Design a binder for this molecule. Structure first.
Ligand code: MG
Ligand code: MG
Ligand code: MG
Ligand code: MG
Ligand code: MG
Ligand code: MG
Ligand code: MG
Ligand code: MG
Ligand code: MG
Ligand code: MG
Ligand code: MG
Ligand code: MG
Ligand code: MG
Ligand code: MG
Ligand code: MG
Ligand code: MG
Ligand code: MG
Ligand code: MG
Ligand code: MG
Ligand code: MG
Ligand code: MG
Ligand code: MG
Ligand code: MG
Ligand code: MG
Ligand code: MG
Ligand code: MG
Ligand code: MG
Ligand code: MG
Ligand code: MG
Ligand code: MG
Ligand code: MG
Ligand code: MG
Ligand code: MG
Ligand code: MG
Ligand code: MG
Ligand code: MG
Ligand code: MG
Ligand code: MG
Ligand code: MG
Ligand code: MG
Ligand code: MG
Ligand code: MG
Ligand code: MG
Ligand code: MG
Ligand code: MG
Ligand code: MG
Ligand code: MG
Ligand code: MG
Ligand code: MG
Ligand code: MG
Ligand code: MG
Ligand code: MG
Ligand code: MG
Ligand code: MG
Ligand code: MG
Ligand code: MG
Ligand code: MG
Ligand code: MG
Ligand code: MG
Ligand code: MG
Ligand code: MG
Ligand code: MG
Ligand code: MG
Lengths: 158, 134, 263
RNA sequence: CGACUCUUAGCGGUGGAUCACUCGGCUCGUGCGUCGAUGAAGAACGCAGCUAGCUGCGAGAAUUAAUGUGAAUUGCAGGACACAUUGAUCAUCGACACUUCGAACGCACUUGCGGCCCCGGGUUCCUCCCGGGGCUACGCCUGUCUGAGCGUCGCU
RNA sequence: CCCCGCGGACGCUACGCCGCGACGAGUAGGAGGGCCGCUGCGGUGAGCCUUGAAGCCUAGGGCGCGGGCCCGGGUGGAGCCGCCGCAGGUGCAGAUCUUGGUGGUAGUAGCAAAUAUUCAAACGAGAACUUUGAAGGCCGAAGUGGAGAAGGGUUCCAUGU
RNA sequence: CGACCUGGGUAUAGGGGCGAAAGACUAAUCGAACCAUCUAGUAGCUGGUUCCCUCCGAAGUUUCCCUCAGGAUAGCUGGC
RNA sequence: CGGCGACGUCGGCUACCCACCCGACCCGUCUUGAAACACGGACCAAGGAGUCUAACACGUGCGCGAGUCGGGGGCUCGCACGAAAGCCGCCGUGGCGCAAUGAAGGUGAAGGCCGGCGCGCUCGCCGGCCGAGGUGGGAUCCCGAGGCCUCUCCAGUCCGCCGAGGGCGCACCACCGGCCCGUCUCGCCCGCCGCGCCGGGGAGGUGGAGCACGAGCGCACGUGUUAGGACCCGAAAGAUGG
RNA sequence: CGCGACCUCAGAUCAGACGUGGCGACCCGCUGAAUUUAAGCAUAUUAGUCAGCGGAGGAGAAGAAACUAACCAGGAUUCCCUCAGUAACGGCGAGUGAACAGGGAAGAGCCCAGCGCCGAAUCCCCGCCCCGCGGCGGGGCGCGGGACAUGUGGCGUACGGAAGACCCGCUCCCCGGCGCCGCUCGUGGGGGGCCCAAGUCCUUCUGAUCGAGGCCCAGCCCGUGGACGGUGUGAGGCCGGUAGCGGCCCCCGGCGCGCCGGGCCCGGGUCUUCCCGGAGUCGGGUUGCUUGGGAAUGCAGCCCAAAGCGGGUGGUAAACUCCAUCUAAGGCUAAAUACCGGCACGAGACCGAUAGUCAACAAGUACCGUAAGGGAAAGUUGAAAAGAACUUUGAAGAGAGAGUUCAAGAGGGCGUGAAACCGUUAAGAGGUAAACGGGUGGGGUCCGCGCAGUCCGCCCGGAGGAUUCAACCCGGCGGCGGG
C-alpha cells in the first residue's frame, strides 16, 4: 500500500532470488590469484614485454566516442603489407595481426604503419641460436638494453 | 610468532592432534629434559623418554633427588612409571603413580646404537645453528 | 547458519481438532521426535527467526578524503603529550614528544639492540606496561582463538625496511607502520587518538611531502592538501580575556536573587 | 496440649537450570580436482586368545610384504622382541592379496540347474563318479573364418 | 604609588553550576533519557582472581522513583569485570506456545468375562501362588488333548541368579 | 448344497482401481490413499508479540474502492 | 536544659512471622462495555516473535563542493594481524549533478540606461556603460538630530551610552514584469553558393516536473513505505515424482 | 548347370579392443508445473523455475562473424563495471525486460569438404631382426594379408589459393637419451623423513604449581623464536612446536649446453595464366512454444521449395532504387569464468550441549512403518583410581564404623547443583479460601565489635624537649619584565 507520496517502485524480487545470489567474499583472493598469474606469466616470457603484443591505434565506432582513440584487436593486413612484414612472422615478432579489420582511411592507415615501423626500430630480436647471431641483433645492445617492458607496448594517447 | 600459513594455531586442532597422535609421534611428545651434566657432555637439551633410563621427579608430590629408573612409558596415558614413585592402595598392594615425562629430568640415558645416533644428530644441528649465529 | 537448519524434518501441522497447538509436528511414531514441534523459532530443534545470511553487507567504504582526514587528525594528536598520556602510554621520561631517531635503527637486526634502543630512548616503560597488562580474555573469545589479550605498545614508523621489522616484532605491543602506508586502525587503535609513535629520520622528513603543507600540496598523493581549520586560535581563555572582547562586554550580574518569602 | 493447614528459615531429598569447559558444528577462503568389466558406488557375510557395538580388514581377514622410525602394545594374559648373522611399535604405502551379491557377465535367484576344455584320484581310459583350474552377458568397431541370396555379372 | 603584618572559603565535568515562575490523568500511538540489563569486538583500567573467578543460596547491610546495583556470610573451584567506542540471534507470564521436570487429584479409580479350591511335607531367610503326595473340581474327543502350515527366531534343553 | 464358507498363488494403483451400488472398499486413512518435495504455499481471519522513567497524546468521521471483519484519502497525533 | 546507658538495655519505619483498622473481584485479550456464566492460563526451568537484503522518501552527522564518487580493475616484503591498509589520475570508463521542453522532427533559458538618428512607426542602426528587474514586508548592519556625566563656570580638546528619524537590505513570502520549450491567434520583415512546399525573426493568450549568479555528490545513522519466508504460529487446498 | 567376381546380408565362447554402472556442487541437451501475485480470475506472474529424463570434464558450454554499426567506423569466445530497471513487452494492469558503444580480466588462432596437381604418394593388421621396454615406439625386411579410385595422403580454405617465369635471400626443424648445468626464483620446484635458543635459578603460596616477590653492571637468559597446545594454576625459557634466502637424507619434474638416433629439406616479392566453395539447406506459408523483440526474437512440426554480380543482415508489413556489411546450411581451439559433491588445508566480531549439522557420544544409530520413508534422546568423578582394604548387622539390596583424597557436603548417569514439588526441624498463626495495598503494634533473627559519646583551626595558662625563628652569606632552580 502506498503511504503518502513516493516513487512507484517495482522491485524485481518475485523470482526466488536468494538461490542465485553472487557474493564477492573471494574478490580479494581472486585479485591475488590473478596478480600472481600475471607475475608468473611475465617471468616466463623473460625479455618479452610482459603485457601482450603491440596493438594498433583505433577510433571508437560511434558519434559519442569517435573523438577518442584506443587500442584495437590488432593490425590489419594492409598496414602489415605497406610496413613490409609478413602476416605469419608478424605474430612471432609480437605484433598481433587482426585479419578482419579493413582500412577506409589513409590517415588511419598511415598512423598504424608509422606505429609498426617505429615499433620495428625499438625491437631487439634475440638470435634463436645464441652461439651464431645470424640476422637478429648485435650482442653489444643485446646484453645491456634487453629488459622486460611493463605496461602496454607503447600506449595510444589522445 | 607463527607465520607459516600451513601450520595451525587453532586450539581445537592442536588439542585434537595432540590427543589422537599415533604412537611414533606420541614418543616425541613425551620428550624429557636432560640434566646439567648430561647437557654439558652432549650438546642436546631435551631427549625423548626411553624405557630403562634413570630419572628424578622435579614437580608434584614426588619431588626430590632419588634417581629412579623408568620402568614403563604408557603412551596411551601420556605418563611414565618410576621405580620408587609408588602409592599403596586400600588392599595394601603397591601401584605406580604416572607422571608426565616433562616433569622429570633424565640423569643417565639408556644408550644403544640408535640412541647414540639421535644424540649425535641433535648435537650436530645445534652446532650448525650456533655457527650460523656466530 | 545452515540454510537447511531446522527445516529437514517434513512435519505436518497436525490439525486443530486435536487438543494441541497448531504448530507443525514431526511425523512417525516410534521415536521421541515423533509428534514434537518443528519449523518454528519457538520450537526446540527448529529454525531460528530470520536466519542470518552471508550477504549481510559486512564492509563499508569511507571516502578517501575522510580517511586521509582521520589520519591527519591521528598524526596531529600523537604530537600532544596530554592526548598521548590520556591514552595511558607512560611517556614522562621521553624527550621531544614527536620522537625521532636516526635511520641507524632502520638497519637493526636483533631484538637485543631493539630493546636497548627503547630503554635508552626511555620508551621501555610503555613496554613494561604492556607486559603487566598481559592476561586472559573473558568469555567465548577464548574458545575462538582470542585467548590472551594485552595493551597497545608504541608505534615505530619507518621509511625503509633494512631489518627493523625483524629486530622489533617480538616486543609485545610494538607495531611497525611504514610511513608510506599509514593505518588509522593502528594510529588510533580503539578509535581514540593519541598513540605513542616513534619516527625515524627518513620517515619524519617524508611526512611533509606525503600529506603536504597548507601552502603547498602533497606531491605523493597528486590531489591532496591538508584540511583547513574553522578556528585558527582555539584557546578561549586568551580570546575571552582579550581587551577587545572585554571592552564590548557588559558588567556581570553576579548577585543571586533567591525567592523572598511573602510576609 | 497433640493432629491438620499456612508462612519463613536451617538441613535433607526430587530435578537438572545456571555457570565454566569443548577432539563438535556453522560460515568464509585456498590448493587440488582422482571412480568403474584390470569389476565401481552400495549391500551381505565373515575375520581378534578373551570381542557385542563402533572401527579396521577379506579365508594371507582389528591384516602380509616393503620403506621410514626406533622399544613398545596394554583391560588381562601370552610369548616374544640379541635393536648387527638386522628391529617392538607406529607411520607411510609403491609389492602381494582382496569372500558373496551388485553395471554383475553361463541360465535363474531356489547357495537351484547346466555346457565345453585341461589336471589329479576312483579309472587302472573307456569313460561313468569325486575334487581342482580356465572359459561360457549384451551391444558395438577393425580384421578372420564359415556361409546365404531366381541381387548384378563372367566362363564354360 | 595599600599594608605592624604579605593574607583572604567554595566554585566553572560550560555536555558544568546556579536562580526564578508555571505546570504534572492517560489507552492506541509518537519521541527523549537511561551511571537499566545480556552477549561478543577494538581501546583502556601497571584492573580483579587458587590468600579463591563465574554460578548459586541467604531472617545480613544498604543505594536508586524505577529498570536494577553494590557490599557481608555460605557454597563453589578458574576464570571475570569497570570506563570510551563498535555489533547484535540482546530482556517474557501468557501464543489450546516448544522441550524437560514436577504437583493436587491420590494411596484414589482400579487389579470383578469363561463354577474352585483344600490338607500335609520338602527346599528355602522368606510360601495363598514353587515342587511332591493326598482330596475336591473343570476342559469332556467340534477339548483347556496330540501334531502341523504361515508367522516368530532360539522363545527349545540343562544349570545357576 | 449354495448367487455357499475359506487358505495359498496371481491380476487390477490414485482422478486410478474395484463395487449385487452403501460414495462402499482400496493396510484403523476415502465425496479422491499414503510418502517426499514445490513449501516457511496464501490468509483482508484468530492467537501471541519480552526493560524502566519522562514528555506529548487520539479515532471510530469525509470522499473513492466487487467496499460493508479491508484499504486509499482528508481530518485527529507525534517528532524535527 | 533534663534522664539513661553493657552481659542488661539503646537505635535500626528497610527485612521474617503474627495481630488489628481502612481499602481491596484474576490476570492477558477482543470489545461500546470483562470479575464475568467470554476465550487462554495446574506449577517451575530453559527456548520463544519487526530481522537481513535491495529500492525509495525525508530528517540528522560528516568530507569535498559545480562538482562528487573508485564501488570494478591495477600497483605495492613473502598472506600473523593483513581477505586489512595505502596508492593510481592519460585508470573518472561510468553514475548522479550542472537544462528544460515536445509524441516527435527538433529547439533550447540577460535584462536595464544614455544619445543621436529610421518616422525614436509601441519601433530598426549602433555608441556608451552596468549586469538577472521591480513593489510590499524583512533578522542583521550603517548614518543619525537630540541628549546622559566630572567641586564649578569660559572655550574645545578624547572616546562611551540612550536615541526620534533616515539608509543599504540576507534568507524567505506575497505580487508584477522578463527569458527557454510545446500549442493557438494576428501580422510584417529579414538571410542566401542552393531562391526553396527553404531558413530565421515579432506581438498577444495559453500547456511545462523550467530559467532568473548553481547544491550536489559520496558516506553514516534514524524513521516511514515497499518486494522478498518478511514480527512469530496457523488452513480448506493446488502441483510433481514415487 | 558347376566354378569364380562383386554386392547385400548372417553366424561364431573367432583375434584384438570399446560402451554399460556410480557421484552429480558447478556444466550441456530436453521436459516441465502449481502454490503465489494480480487484494476475485482465465492472458499475464510464479518460470523456462521445482519435480522428471538423458550426457560430461576438472571445469563445461561458447568461440574465430551469413557480427556490430551507420561512426573519422569497430573486429572470435567467456567473465566484471556500466549501459539500465533503460529501449522494449505487458487484461499497456500486476508486473517483466535485454543489446550496442565505453572501461577492464584474459587474449590465440586455425583445420577440412569442394576446385585442382601429384604413377594411392595414404592407412590398418600379422610375422623378422635388431635399438629399446617401462603407459611400449624407431628403423629397415616380407614375390605377407586387408582397407582404399563409391577417393587415402601431400599442397591448399575465403586473410584468397595454385602453376610458370624474373629478382633476392642460403638465410637452418622437431621430436629421445648421455654428462653436467643453470643450480629450479619468492628465493627448493615439488613430495617424504629427522633435527636445531633460552630458568624448571633464590625465597615463598598451594593438594599440585604454569602464581607472587628477587636476580649487581642497566640490569636473570633467548628473542629473525613473546603463535599455539600439553604439563596436577595463569609457562617466551619443562615438552612438542614457533622464527629462520636454517641443517641433513631419499624420491620425482620442466628447464641450457658438447655428443649421439632418426627423419626434414625453399622462403619472400613482381608479372602472366588459371581456380574458387557446404541443399529437403536457405527462404516463404501456417501451426505450437519461446523472447524485451513489438504486422511475428528464436526453436520445432507440416506444406512449398531456391539462387549465383547470388545469399543473409540493415529491430514497422510491401514494391522500386542506391548503399553498407558479412559469406550460412562442415570441424577444432587455451586463458580470463563457475563449483552447497570429493581429497587436504587455513581462518572467524559465528554457536556453545533445548544452542551449533539430525548427529560433540557404538547417529542416519536405537526405534517406527508392508513399503516409499520418518528418525531421536544421550557430554563433564578425580591431578592421579588413590574406584573405599578391614570390622560389624542383614539372605541380600542397604547401613554403621574405618580408609583414600585438598575435597566423597567429588563414591562409576559421580564438576556446580536453581526453581517447581516433598520430608523433617525451629518459630509464629489459624471458624468469613488464600493472597494483596496503606497504617501502626507485638515477637524474633541479625546489624551498629552501640553502650559514658565528638572532632579540630586560633588564642590563654601550666608543665617540658629540640633544632634552630627572623635576618643575612653562598650555590642550585623556577615565575615575571626588559628599548
Ligand atoms: Mg537448531
Ligand atoms: Mg560470563
Ligand atoms: Mg522446609
Ligand atoms: Mg535444597
Ligand atoms: Mg609389515
Ligand atoms: Mg523355485
Ligand atoms: Mg546367386
Ligand atoms: Mg496538577
Ligand atoms: Mg503524564
Ligand atoms: Mg530473540
Ligand atoms: Mg527466558
Ligand atoms: Mg516462562
Ligand atoms: Mg480401592
Ligand atoms: Mg475388584
Ligand atoms: Mg465335566
Ligand atoms: Mg525353557
Ligand atoms: Mg447419497
Ligand atoms: Mg481402511
Ligand atoms: Mg487422488
Ligand atoms: Mg469496481
Ligand atoms: Mg475481530
Ligand atoms: Mg480474545
Ligand atoms: Mg460483544
Ligand atoms: Mg477499543
Ligand atoms: Mg479482563
Ligand atoms: Mg454473566
Ligand atoms: Mg475467540
Ligand atoms: Mg483451560
Ligand atoms: Mg500451557
Ligand atoms: Mg584494498
Ligand atoms: Mg564525471
Ligand atoms: Mg523586496
Ligand atoms: Mg511572473
Ligand atoms: Mg513515506
Ligand atoms: Mg511466516
Ligand atoms: Mg519486511
Ligand atoms: Mg502454512
Ligand atoms: Mg486452483
Ligand atoms: Mg574373442
Ligand atoms: Mg490471487
Ligand atoms: Mg489475497
Ligand atoms: Mg483464489
Ligand atoms: Mg531439475
Ligand atoms: Mg552415464
Ligand atoms: Mg570445450
Ligand atoms: Mg566448440
Ligand atoms: Mg540511472
Ligand atoms: Mg520472463
Ligand atoms: Mg588486458
Ligand atoms: Mg583429397
Ligand atoms: Mg572465416
Ligand atoms: Mg596450559
Ligand atoms: Mg606456554
Ligand atoms: Mg625447547
Ligand atoms: Mg623453521
Ligand atoms: Mg523499416
Ligand atoms: Mg543438538
Ligand atoms: Mg548445561
Ligand atoms: Mg536434535
Ligand atoms: Mg546422522
Ligand atoms: Mg570442595
Ligand atoms: Mg566437588
Ligand atoms: Mg553432582
Amino acid at each position: 500500500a502506498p503511504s503518502r507520496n513516493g516513487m512507484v517502485l517495482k522491485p524485481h524480487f518475485h523470482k526466488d532470488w536468494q538461490r542465485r545470489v553472487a557474493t564477492w567474499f573471494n574478490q580479494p583472493a581472486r585479485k591475488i590469484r590473478r596478480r600472481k598469474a600475471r607475475q608468473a606469466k611475465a617471468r616466463r616470457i623473460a625479455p618479452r614485454p610482459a603485457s601482450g603484443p603491440i596493438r594498433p591505434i583505433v577510433r571508437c565506432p560511434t558519434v559519442r566516442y569517435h573523438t577518442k582513440v584506443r587500442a584495437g584487436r590488432g593490425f590489419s593486413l594492409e598496414e602489415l603489407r605497406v610496413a613490409g612484414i609478413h602476416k605469419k612472422v608478424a605474430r612471432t615478432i609480437g605484433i598481433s595481426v587482426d585479419p578482419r579489420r579493413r582500412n577506409k582511411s589513409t590517415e588511419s592507415l598511415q598512423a598504424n604503419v608509422q606505429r609498426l615501423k617505429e615499433y620495428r626500430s625499438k625491437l631487439i630480436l634475440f638470435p634463436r641460436k645464441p652461439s651464431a647471431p645470424k640476422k637478429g641483433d648485435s650482442s653489444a645492445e643485446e646484453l645491456k638494453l634487453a629488459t622486460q617492458l611493463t605496461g602496454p607496448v607503447m600506449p595510444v594517447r589522445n | 610468532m607463527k607465520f607459516n600459513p600451513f601450520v595451525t594455531s587453532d586450539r581445537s586442532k592442536n588439542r585434537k592432534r595432540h590427543f589422537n597422535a599415533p604412537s611414533h609421534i606420541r614418543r616425541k611428545i613425551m620428550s624429557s629434559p636432560l640434566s646439567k651434566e648430561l647437557r654439558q657432555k652432549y650438546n642436546v637439551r631435551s631427549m625423548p623418554i626411553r624405557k630403562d633410563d634413570e630419572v628424578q621427579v622435579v614437580r608434584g608430590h614426588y619431588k626430590g633427588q632419588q634417581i629412579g629408573k623408568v620402568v614403563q612409558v604408557y603412551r596411551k596415558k601420556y605418563v611414565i612409571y618410576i621405580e620408587r614413585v609408588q602409592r599403596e592402595k586400600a588392599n595394601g598392594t603397591t601401584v605406580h603413580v604416572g607422571i608426565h615425562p616433562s616433569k622429570v629430568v633424565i640423569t643417565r640415558l639408556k644408550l644403544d646404537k640408535d640412541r647414540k645416533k639421535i644424540l649425535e644428530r641433535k648435537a650436530k644441528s645445534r652446532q650448525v645453528g650456533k655457527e650460523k649465529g656466530k | 547458519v545452515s540454510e537447511l537448519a531446522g527445516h529437514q524434518t517434513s512435519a505436518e501441522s497436525w490439525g486443530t481438532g486435536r487438543a494441541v497447538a497448531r504448530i507443525p509436528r514431526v511425523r512417525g511414531g516410534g521415536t521421541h521426535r515423533s509428534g514434537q514441534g518443528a519449523f518454528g523459532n519457538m520450537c526446540r530443534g527448529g529454525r531460528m527467526f530470520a536466519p542470518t545470511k552471508t550477504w549481510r553487507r559486512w564492509h563499508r567504504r569511507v571516502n578517501t578524503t575522510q580517511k586521509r582526514y582521520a589520519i591527519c587528525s591521528a598524526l596531529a594528536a600523537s604530537a600532544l603529550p596530554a592526548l598521548v598520556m590520556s591514552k595511558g602510554h607512560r611517556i614522562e621520561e621521553v624527550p621531544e614528544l614527536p620522537l625521532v631517531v636516526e635511520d641507524k635503527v632502520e638497519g637493526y637486526k636483533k631484538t637485543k639492540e631493539a630493546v636497548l634502543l627503547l630503554k635508552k630512548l626511555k620508551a621501555w616503560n610503555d613496554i613494561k606496561k604492556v607486559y603487566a597488562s598481559q592476561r586472559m580474555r573473558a568469555g567465548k573469545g577464548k574458545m575462538r582463538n582470542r585467548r590472551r589479550i594485552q595493551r597497545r605498545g608504541p608505534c615505530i614508523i619507518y621509511n625503509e625496511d633494512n631489518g627493523i621489522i625483524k629486530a622489533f616484532r617480538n616486543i609485545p605491543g610494538i607495531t611497525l607502520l611504514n610511513v608510506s602506508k599509514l593505518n588509522i586502525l593502528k594510529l588510533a587503535p580503539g578509535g581514540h587518538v593519541g598513540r605513542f609513535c616513534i619516527w625515524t629520520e627518513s620517515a619524519f622528513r617524508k611526512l611533509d611531502e606525503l600529506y603536504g603543507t597548507w601552502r603547498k600540496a602533497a606531491s605523493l598523493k597528486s590531489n591532496y592538501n591538508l584540511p583547513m581549520h574553522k578556528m585558527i586560535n582555539t584557546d578561549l581563555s586568551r580570546i575571552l580575556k582579550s581587551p577587545e572582547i572585554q571592552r564590548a562586554l557588559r558588567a556581570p550580574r553576579k548577585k543571586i536573587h533567591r525567592r523572598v518569602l511573602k510576609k
